[PDB]
Paper text:
TDP-43 protein has several functions, and its modular structure facilitates this multitasking. Two centrally located RNA recognition motifs (RRM) strongly bind UG-rich RNA (Lukavsky et al., 2013) or TG-rich DNA (Austin et al., 2014) directing TDP-43 to pre-mRNAs and intronic sites (Tollervey et al., 2011). At the N terminus, a ubiquitin or dix-like domain (Mompeán et al., 2016, Qin et al., 2014) provides a polymerization surface that enables formation of dimer and higher-order oligomers predominantly found in the cell nucleus (Afroz et al., 2017).
A fragment of TDP-43 comprising residues 1-270 including NTD and RRMs was used in crystallization experiments and the structure of the NTD (residues 1-80) was elucidated at 2.55 Å resolution. The NTD adopts a similar conformation as reported in a recent crystallographic structure obtained in P63 space group (Afroz et al., 2017). A sulfate ion binds at the interface between the molecules and is bonded to Arg52 and Arg55, which serves as a wedge, increasing the distance between the monomers. The changes in the position of the monomers against each other alter the superhelical bundle arrangement observed previously (Afroz et al., 2017). Each spiral, with radius of 46 Å, has 10 NTD molecules in a full turn with distance between two rings being ~36 Å.
Residue numbers in the entry: 2 to 79
Write the structure that this text describes.
């Protein structure tokens, strides 16, 4: 039952987004909860700077360090 936590505000309580069997997350799993979302970002706990999730053909790839216990934030266009 592996998942990642996604919110549109670190203020708000996040939603649990299930991962696939290969450990990736489908953009479609995110957009079902956050229609219009064009990607994920998180605070790098080392740099304390915001950091992007790799996205290739509707597939979100875990950071090299793994998904971990991080809260991910959705990006929308304007």
């Amino acid at each position: 039952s592996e998942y990642i936590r996604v919110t549109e505000d670190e203020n708000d309580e996040p939603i649990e987004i299930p991962s696939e069997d290969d450990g990736t997350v489908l953009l479609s799993t995110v957009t079902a909860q956050f229609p219009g979302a064009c990607g994920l970002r998180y605070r790098n706990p080392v740099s304390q700077c915001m950091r992007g999730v790799r996205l290739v053909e509707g597939i979100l790839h875990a950071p090299d360090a793994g998904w971990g216990n991080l809260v991910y934030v959705v990006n929308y266009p304007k």
